[PDB]
Amino acid sequence: SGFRKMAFPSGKVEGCMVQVTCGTTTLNGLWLDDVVYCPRHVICTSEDMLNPNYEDLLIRKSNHNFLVQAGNVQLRVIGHSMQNCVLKLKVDTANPKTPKYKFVRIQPGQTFSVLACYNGSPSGVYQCAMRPNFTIKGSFLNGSCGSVGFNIDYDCVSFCYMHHMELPTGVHAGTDLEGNFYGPFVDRQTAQAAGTDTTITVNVLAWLYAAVINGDRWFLNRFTTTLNDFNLVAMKYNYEPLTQDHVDILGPLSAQTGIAVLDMCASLKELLQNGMNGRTILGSALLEDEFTPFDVVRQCSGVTFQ
Amino acid sequence: SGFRKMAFPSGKVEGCMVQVTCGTTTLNGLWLDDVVYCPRHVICTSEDMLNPNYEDLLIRKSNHNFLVQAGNVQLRVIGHSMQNCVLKLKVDTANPKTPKYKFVRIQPGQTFSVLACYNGSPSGVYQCAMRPNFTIKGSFLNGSCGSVGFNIDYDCVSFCYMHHMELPTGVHAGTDLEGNFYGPFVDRQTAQAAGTDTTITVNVLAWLYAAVINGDRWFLNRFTTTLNDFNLVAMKYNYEPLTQDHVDILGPLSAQTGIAVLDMCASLKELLQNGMNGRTILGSALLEDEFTPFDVVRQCSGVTFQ
Ligand SMILES: *[C@](O)(C(N)=O)[C@H](C[C@@H]1CCNC1=O)NC(=O)[C@H](CC1CC1)n1cccc(NC(=O)OC(C)(C)C)c1=O
Ligand SMILES: *[C@](O)(C(N)=O)[C@H](C[C@@H]1CCNC1=O)NC(=O)[C@H](CC1CC1)n1cccc(NC(=O)OC(C)(C)C)c1=O
Ligand SMILES: [Cl-]
């Protein structure tokens, strides 16, 4: 009973956070096995940030220019390389708390937990989504760079995000753990703007299913819709197109509630056209788009992590 | 920048969570030193839960009846006692990952993080407030009992909540770690209901401060109200009275933004009387009351925990 925006438990990632310092710049690093990963802009001064030639900057650095601290213990750096926009520091010590893990690149509309860190120390955890414009709506202050986003499957941590920068209107941009940016952003202190954002329709529908599961039913109507007619209405309110794959993906939730996906779509269509009339769904006065169908199943079925 | 509902890092609690099985009932326990703490209704069947005579049922229990599992490892139970609604199982092994901890009773209006567990394994983490009617709006399925609520200050875990119950309306009740219920609820199957709730005025003001810190300022106005005039209005909308102590507690946020509390209160008065008129504050179309002044200061100044 109840439905909450729920993060993964963070303990397996907490054990991997370290502090990386290069001269006067400090930020967070991820220590897995004998590698520490962090944003490459740890090597820049404020001078360099406007237009850094990173390759050039790194050449002038040495192993001993990188100070890596795990709690009380300094780790000796014995090597360094750059992959895309991340720096990999080989250290002499493998992390005894390294979990089973992999690195993944997620798609827009997918969700993940962020462990916000300052000076190598966990501060807080929260769930967000990769927006269709390839930003995230995070909560990040100066010092948070190198904080990571992740999913847990059973006992395997999938790392999908590392934090690099803030963009206009207080949204955030970063990379996968191979150092490729999500979206068309660069790690440069420069004028950059995200595209116009849209609502993740398939996630809105999953959350309507969560509502029904949790006993909010008032928005169910008597109608059905075609996919074509649903999209005509959705386009008009800046919703992402719903595809047949999305319809198929919502099938398990549809079977659990006995409400056909295109019946739920007719309900959503009406909500978009007429509004909510000051009425709430799962205690929300707007439609929520940061739960995937899998997130809903997980929470409503009680999936747990080893 | 940005502002999210943020839980504490859950790792220190995760290392304390175990599974407690008695006959047909499995739920979660908290393993600290050589004691496992769990809800005493673990000892009941179904006909027991009418009005269970806990003291009598416990006498008939053997230590051997309590199957405590910590990951792959059976903990041997060597004693058992009851304190109010909590069972203390003495086991032959002290938990090596026992953090620094305290047991505290929180006040209504204050927040904490919930680590929702099933079968002694973490499922997720989220932030809650102890409501003025002594319920929490959580997300708990069958198997969740024994999940705890906590705060962390530096390296110290303050355990404030252990989960026992769902009520009608999909809200939740439980005890402190000395086993005393928050509110007038009892641990048996008997029809039980939350009293009427109220909005935590001081928390709504803190969140309006959070919004200003983040540059969301459209609702600010040049007007001022007296405290009495504010309370005349807010009380009509089922908000808690704002006291001078609340005004003092908001001092830091007031000083940080330069906006006097009684200035800010005129915004709140106007938002109550006229609604938001299609706009949002920190992405919400409703007034949020589950951030304390401290939560705002912590998240907006990046304070850290290890
Ligand atoms: C990390 O480098 C860090 N040390 O934590 C920084 C985190 C951000 C600070 C404020 N919020 C954050 O998430 N990242 C930066 O400071 C980046 C560096 C990046 C380019 C390599 N950075 C530098 C300069 C400016 C900005 N952003 C900025 O000015 O944003 C607006 C919205 C004002 C245009 C930035 O992100
Ligand atoms: C735990 O005991 C557990 N095993 O996990 C139960 C957790 C709840 C089940 C679903 N969500 C929960 O939070 N708690 C109970 O089942 C309690 C037992 C407690 C009192 C000793 N319990 C027992 C009977 C009834 C109810 N509530 C109930 O039926 O509520 C509705 C809303 C259906 C009227 C209850 O919580
Ligand atoms: Cl809302």
Side-chain angles (χ1 to χ4, degrees):
Chain A
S1 49
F3 193 78
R4 275 295 192 125
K5 188 158 287 163
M6 190 164 302
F8 292 98
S10 57
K12 286 172 149 62
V13 178
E14 286 172 58
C16 302
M17 297 312 302
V18 298
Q19 183 182 22
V20 182
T21 304
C22 188
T24 181
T25 311
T26 291
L27 47 61
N28 306 285
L30 187 64
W31 182 23
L32 300 168
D33 301 326
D34 56 349
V35 183
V36 174
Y37 309 73
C38 68
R40 64 177 173 173
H41 72 261
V42 71
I43 74 186
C44 304
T45 78
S46 38
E47 158 84 283
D48 301 313
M49 280 302 329
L50 279 316
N51 182 44
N53 180 342
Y54 283 105
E55 296 85 0
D56 189 73
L57 289 176
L58 188 67
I59 287 176
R60 275 144 42 173
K61 297 290 161 179
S62 268
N63 285 333
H64 206 251
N65 294 136
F66 297 98
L67 202 189
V68 183
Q69 282 152 129
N72 293 291
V73 190
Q74 308 194 177
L75 309 185
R76 183 189 277 290
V77 179
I78 56 175
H80 60 272
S81 48
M82 168 162 87
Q83 187 182 11
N84 298 309
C85 307
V86 302
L87 195 68
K88 304 188 287 193
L89 306 176
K90 186 100 85 181
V91 288
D92 61 1
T93 307
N95 186 353
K97 294 169 196 171
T98 302
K100 283 206 226 163
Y101 69 93
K102 62 214 281 289
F103 291 171
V104 301
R105 180 166 188 99
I106 58 164
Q107 320 271 249
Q110 294 191 277
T111 56
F112 63 87
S113 287
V114 173
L115 179 66
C117 308
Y118 298 87
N119 305 116
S121 304
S123 149
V125 63
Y126 60 86
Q127 181 81 170
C128 48
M130 183 54 68
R131 308 297 307 164
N133 71 359
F134 300 105
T135 68
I136 72 161
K137 302 168 108 157
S139 164
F140 290 110
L141 308 173
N142 197 212
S144 61
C145 284
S147 294
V148 293
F150 61 97
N151 282 269
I152 309 178
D153 178 285
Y154 184 50
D155 57 355
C156 178
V157 180
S158 293
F159 295 98
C160 57
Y161 181 86
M162 173 174 276
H163 182 53
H164 292 241
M165 61 198 313
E166 186 166 310
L167 293 172
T169 70
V171 298
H172 297 106
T175 65
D176 65 23
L177 265 301
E178 294 184 319
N180 300 126
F181 265 93
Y182 291 104
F185 309 113
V186 288
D187 57 347
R188 194 181 156 194
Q189 179 170 345
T190 208
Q192 301 184 77
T196 309
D197 206 17
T198 52
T199 299
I200 312 146
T201 309
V202 64
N203 290 184
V204 173
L205 290 165
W207 172 83
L208 292 178
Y209 277 108
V212 172
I213 290 164
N214 286 277
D216 277 301
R217 291 184 173 259
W218 65 262
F219 54 83
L220 299 171
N221 74 18
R222 290 161 184 279
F223 291 98
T224 194
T225 186
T226 68
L227 198 59
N228 177 256
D229 289 338
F230 174 88
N231 284 321
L232 257 36
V233 169
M235 270 153 47
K236 162 176 176 144
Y237 299 84
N238 295 316
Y239 269 52
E240 286 291 293
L242 192 68
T243 67
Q244 191 60 54
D245 284 13
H246 297 322
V247 170
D248 295 336
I249 288 160
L250 288 157
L253 280 170
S254 167
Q256 164 164 8
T257 53
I259 299 152
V261 167
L262 290 177
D263 292 13
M264 195 62 85
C265 290
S267 292
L268 176 51
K269 177 195 310 182
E270 187 180 321
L271 286 167
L272 287 187
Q273 280 172 161
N274 299 172
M276 285 199 226
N277 310 254
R279 226 225 211 239
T280 66
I281 302 171
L282 289 171
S284 188
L286 39 80
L287 304 172
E288 175 60 55
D289 79 339
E290 298 207 350
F291 296 94
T292 72
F294 179 68
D295 294 341
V296 170
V297 164
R298 269 201 297 122
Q299 182 175 162
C300 296
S301 83
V303 169
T304 195
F305 305 106
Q306 292 280 123
Chain B
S1 72
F3 195 77
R4 275 286 188 174
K5 193 151 290 160
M6 190 171 289
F8 292 96
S10 61
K12 285 163 143 43
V13 177
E14 287 169 50
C16 298
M17 295 309 297
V18 300
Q19 181 183 9
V20 182
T21 304
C22 190
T24 213
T25 306
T26 300
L27 49 65
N28 304 287
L30 189 68
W31 183 21
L32 301 176
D33 302 313
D34 57 341
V35 180
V36 173
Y37 303 73
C38 65
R40 61 172 177 178
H41 66 268
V42 72
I43 73 191
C44 309
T45 65
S46 262
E47 69 282 7
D48 287 312
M49 282 243 283
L50 275 50
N51 297 250
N53 192 331
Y54 282 111
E55 168 168 57
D56 242 293
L57 292 166
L58 189 52
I59 282 161
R60 299 207 168 66
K61 289 296 163 202
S62 170
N63 296 320
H64 189 262
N65 290 152
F66 294 101
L67 200 205
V68 183
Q69 252 148 345
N72 305 285
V73 177
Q74 197 187 131
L75 296 187
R76 206 254 292 244
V77 173
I78 67 171
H80 57 261
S81 63
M82 167 163 80
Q83 184 183 3
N84 304 301
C85 303
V86 161
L87 192 64
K88 304 197 294 207
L89 297 184
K90 180 88 75 183
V91 291
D92 63 10
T93 310
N95 188 354
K97 304 169 199 187
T98 299
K100 307 194 187 187
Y101 70 94
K102 219 205 311 285
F103 290 170
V104 308
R105 194 173 175 89
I106 44 160
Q107 296 295 308
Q110 301 304 117
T111 56
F112 57 95
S113 301
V114 167
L115 182 63
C117 298
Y118 298 90
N119 299 111
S121 299
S123 186
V125 65
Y126 54 87
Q127 193 75 169
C128 278
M130 181 55 70
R131 298 304 308 176
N133 69 2
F134 295 109
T135 67
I136 70 177
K137 295 172 174 164
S139 167
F140 291 111
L141 302 170
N142 193 234
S144 65
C145 288
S147 300
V148 292
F150 60 104
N151 287 281
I152 307 175
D153 200 66
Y154 294 101
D155 49 359
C156 193
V157 185
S158 289
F159 295 105
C160 57
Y161 178 84
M162 176 171 266
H163 179 60
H164 295 243
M165 259 181 85
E166 55 166 354
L167 297 161
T169 62
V171 305
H172 303 98
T175 62
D176 62 26
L177 263 300
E178 290 175 340
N180 295 124
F181 264 93
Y182 295 95
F185 306 107
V186 293
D187 58 343
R188 59 198 180 242
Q189 186 168 3
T190 202
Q192 273 182 96
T196 307
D197 204 17
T198 60
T199 302
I200 314 155
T201 307
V202 68
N203 287 186
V204 178
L205 287 165
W207 169 82
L208 288 175
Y209 280 109
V212 175
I213 290 166
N214 280 276
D216 214 0
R217 58 211 196 66
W218 63 262
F219 56 81
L220 290 181
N221 62 42
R222 77 188 107 109
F223 316 106
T224 259
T225 181
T226 65
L227 185 53
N228 281 345
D229 287 351
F230 175 74
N231 282 321
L232 268 31
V233 172
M235 250 99 91
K236 291 157 55 82
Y237 289 84
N238 191 225
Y239 276 49
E240 296 276 71
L242 192 75
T243 67
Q244 184 59 51
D245 291 11
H246 298 323
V247 171
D248 295 343
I249 288 168
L250 287 166
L253 290 179
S254 192
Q256 183 182 342
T257 57
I259 299 161
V261 171
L262 289 186
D263 185 349
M264 186 61 89
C265 284
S267 288
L268 178 48
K269 167 147 71 200
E270 185 181 294
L271 290 167
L272 289 181
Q273 292 180 134
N274 294 127
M276 287 196 212
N277 210 57
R279 308 187 68 172
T280 67
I281 298 178
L282 288 174
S284 178
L286 286 172
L287 303 173
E288 255 276 2
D289 81 343
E290 297 215 343
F291 297 92
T292 64
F294 183 64
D295 294 334
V296 173
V297 166
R298 107 170 185 64
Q299 163 161 181
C300 289
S301 77
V303 314
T304 210
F305 310 106
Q306 283 209 124

PDB file of all heavy atoms in Angstrom, chain B residues 4-17:
ATOM      1  N   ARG B   4      15.475  18.055  -4.723  1.00  0.00           N
ATOM      2  CA  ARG B   4      14.844  16.754  -4.851  1.00  0.00           C
ATOM      3  C   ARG B   4      14.495  16.239  -3.466  1.00  0.00           C
ATOM      4  O   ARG B   4      15.190  16.560  -2.506  1.00  0.00           O
ATOM      5  CB  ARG B   4      15.825  15.742  -5.445  1.00  0.00           C
ATOM      6  CG  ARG B   4      15.887  15.757  -6.952  1.00  0.00           C
ATOM      7  CD  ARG B   4      14.643  15.097  -7.516  1.00  0.00           C
ATOM      8  NE  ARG B   4      14.792  14.943  -8.950  1.00  0.00           N
ATOM      9  CZ  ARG B   4      13.927  14.302  -9.721  1.00  0.00           C
ATOM     10  NH1 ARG B   4      12.913  13.669  -9.148  1.00  0.00           N
ATOM     11  NH2 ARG B   4      14.063  14.318 -11.042  1.00  0.00           N
ATOM     12  N   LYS B   5      13.505  15.351  -3.394  1.00  0.00           N
ATOM     13  CA  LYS B   5      13.266  14.629  -2.156  1.00  0.00           C
ATOM     14  C   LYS B   5      14.375  13.587  -2.017  1.00  0.00           C
ATOM     15  O   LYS B   5      14.465  12.670  -2.816  1.00  0.00           O
ATOM     16  CB  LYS B   5      11.875  13.995  -2.132  1.00  0.00           C
ATOM     17  CG  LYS B   5      11.455  13.508  -0.750  1.00  0.00           C
ATOM     18  CD  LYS B   5       9.963  13.533  -0.519  1.00  0.00           C
ATOM     19  CE  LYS B   5       9.415  14.939  -0.402  1.00  0.00           C
ATOM     20  NZ  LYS B   5       7.956  14.939  -0.648  1.00  0.00           N
ATOM     21  N   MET B   6      15.231  13.774  -1.009  1.00  0.00           N
ATOM     22  CA  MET B   6      16.496  13.079  -0.916  1.00  0.00           C
ATOM     23  C   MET B   6      16.499  12.261   0.378  1.00  0.00           C
ATOM     24  O   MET B   6      16.225  12.782   1.454  1.00  0.00           O
ATOM     25  CB  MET B   6      17.608  14.135  -0.923  1.00  0.00           C
ATOM     26  CG  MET B   6      18.996  13.608  -1.066  1.00  0.00           C
ATOM     27  SD  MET B   6      20.214  14.966  -1.335  1.00  0.00           S
ATOM     28  CE  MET B   6      19.799  15.477  -2.995  1.00  0.00           C
ATOM     29  N   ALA B   7      16.782  10.970   0.266  1.00  0.00           N
ATOM     30  CA  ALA B   7      16.952  10.117   1.425  1.00  0.00           C
ATOM     31  C   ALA B   7      18.419  10.107   1.858  1.00  0.00           C
ATOM     32  O   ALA B   7      19.294  10.527   1.092  1.00  0.00           O
ATOM     33  CB  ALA B   7      16.439   8.742   1.081  1.00  0.00           C
ATOM     34  N   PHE B   8      18.692   9.662   3.099  1.00  0.00           N
ATOM     35  CA  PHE B   8      20.073   9.444   3.501  1.00  0.00           C
ATOM     36  C   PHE B   8      20.625   8.219   2.776  1.00  0.00           C
ATOM     37  O   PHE B   8      19.888   7.298   2.423  1.00  0.00           O
ATOM     38  CB  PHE B   8      20.228   9.278   5.016  1.00  0.00           C
ATOM     39  CG  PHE B   8      19.944  10.529   5.808  1.00  0.00           C
ATOM     40  CD1 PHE B   8      18.688  10.738   6.356  1.00  0.00           C
ATOM     41  CD2 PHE B   8      20.900  11.526   5.928  1.00  0.00           C
ATOM     42  CE1 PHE B   8      18.409  11.905   7.045  1.00  0.00           C
ATOM     43  CE2 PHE B   8      20.626  12.684   6.639  1.00  0.00           C
ATOM     44  CZ  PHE B   8      19.381  12.873   7.193  1.00  0.00           C
ATOM     45  N   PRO B   9      21.952   8.157   2.559  1.00  0.00           N
ATOM     46  CA  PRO B   9      22.600   6.922   2.098  1.00  0.00           C
ATOM     47  C   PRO B   9      22.268   5.775   3.050  1.00  0.00           C
ATOM     48  O   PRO B   9      22.444   5.936   4.248  1.00  0.00           O
ATOM     49  CB  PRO B   9      24.103   7.232   2.209  1.00  0.00           C
ATOM     50  CG  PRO B   9      24.162   8.741   2.157  1.00  0.00           C
ATOM     51  CD  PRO B   9      22.916   9.217   2.887  1.00  0.00           C
ATOM     52  N   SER B  10      21.842   4.630   2.515  1.00  0.00           N
ATOM     53  CA  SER B  10      21.226   3.582   3.312  1.00  0.00           C
ATOM     54  C   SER B  10      22.203   2.475   3.761  1.00  0.00           C
ATOM     55  O   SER B  10      21.818   1.573   4.518  1.00  0.00           O
ATOM     56  CB  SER B  10      20.094   3.002   2.537  1.00  0.00           C
ATOM     57  OG  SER B  10      20.579   2.440   1.329  1.00  0.00           O
ATOM     58  N   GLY B  11      23.466   2.539   3.323  1.00  0.00           N
ATOM     59  CA  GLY B  11      24.429   1.454   3.492  1.00  0.00           C
ATOM     60  C   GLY B  11      24.649   1.015   4.946  1.00  0.00           C
ATOM     61  O   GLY B  11      24.773  -0.182   5.227  1.00  0.00           O
ATOM     62  N   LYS B  12      24.710   1.968   5.875  1.00  0.00           N
ATOM     63  CA  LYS B  12      24.918   1.623   7.273  1.00  0.00           C
ATOM     64  C   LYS B  12      23.748   0.834   7.854  1.00  0.00           C
ATOM     65  O   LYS B  12      23.933   0.020   8.763  1.00  0.00           O
ATOM     66  CB  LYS B  12      25.081   2.884   8.108  1.00  0.00           C
ATOM     67  CG  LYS B  12      26.412   3.605   7.978  1.00  0.00           C
ATOM     68  CD  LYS B  12      26.285   5.023   8.503  1.00  0.00           C
ATOM     69  CE  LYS B  12      27.521   5.484   9.231  1.00  0.00           C
ATOM     70  NZ  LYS B  12      28.734   5.084   8.489  1.00  0.00           N
ATOM     71  N   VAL B  13      22.540   1.085   7.343  1.00  0.00           N
ATOM     72  CA  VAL B  13      21.371   0.366   7.806  1.00  0.00           C
ATOM     73  C   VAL B  13      21.290  -0.989   7.106  1.00  0.00           C
ATOM     74  O   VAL B  13      20.909  -1.982   7.735  1.00  0.00           O
ATOM     75  CB  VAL B  13      20.095   1.199   7.610  1.00  0.00           C
ATOM     76  CG1 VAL B  13      18.842   0.433   8.018  1.00  0.00           C
ATOM     77  CG2 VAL B  13      20.194   2.538   8.322  1.00  0.00           C
ATOM     78  N   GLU B  14      21.628  -1.031   5.814  1.00  0.00           N
ATOM     79  CA  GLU B  14      21.538  -2.259   5.037  1.00  0.00           C
ATOM     80  C   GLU B  14      22.326  -3.385   5.718  1.00  0.00           C
ATOM     81  O   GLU B  14      21.890  -4.532   5.742  1.00  0.00           O
ATOM     82  CB  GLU B  14      22.116  -2.069   3.633  1.00  0.00           C
ATOM     83  CG  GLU B  14      21.271  -1.244   2.676  1.00  0.00           C
ATOM     84  CD  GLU B  14      21.988  -0.860   1.383  1.00  0.00           C
ATOM     85  OE1 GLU B  14      22.567  -1.760   0.722  1.00  0.00           O
ATOM     86  OE2 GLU B  14      21.986   0.344   1.049  1.00  0.00           O
ATOM     87  N   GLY B  15      23.498  -3.053   6.272  1.00  0.00           N
ATOM     88  CA  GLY B  15      24.333  -4.041   6.940  1.00  0.00           C
ATOM     89  C   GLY B  15      23.759  -4.547   8.271  1.00  0.00           C
ATOM     90  O   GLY B  15      24.354  -5.429   8.886  1.00  0.00           O
ATOM     91  N   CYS B  16      22.603  -4.008   8.706  1.00  0.00           N
ATOM     92  CA  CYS B  16      21.979  -4.402   9.958  1.00  0.00           C
ATOM     93  C   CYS B  16      20.708  -5.229   9.722  1.00  0.00           C
ATOM     94  O   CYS B  16      20.108  -5.754  10.669  1.00  0.00           O
ATOM     95  CB  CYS B  16      21.640  -3.169  10.783  1.00  0.00           C
ATOM     96  SG  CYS B  16      23.082  -2.180  11.273  1.00  0.00           S
ATOM     97  N   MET B  17      20.266  -5.331   8.466  1.00  0.00           N
ATOM     98  CA  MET B  17      18.962  -5.894   8.185  1.00  0.00           C
ATOM     99  C   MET B  17      19.095  -7.410   8.095  1.00  0.00           C
ATOM    100  O   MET B  17      20.004  -7.919   7.458  1.00  0.00           O
ATOM    101  CB  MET B  17      18.408  -5.350   6.868  1.00  0.00           C
ATOM    102  CG  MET B  17      18.134  -3.856   6.921  1.00  0.00           C
ATOM    103  SD  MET B  17      17.139  -3.375   8.342  1.00  0.00           S
ATOM    104  CE  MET B  17      15.614  -4.259   8.019  1.00  0.00           C
TER     105      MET B  17
END
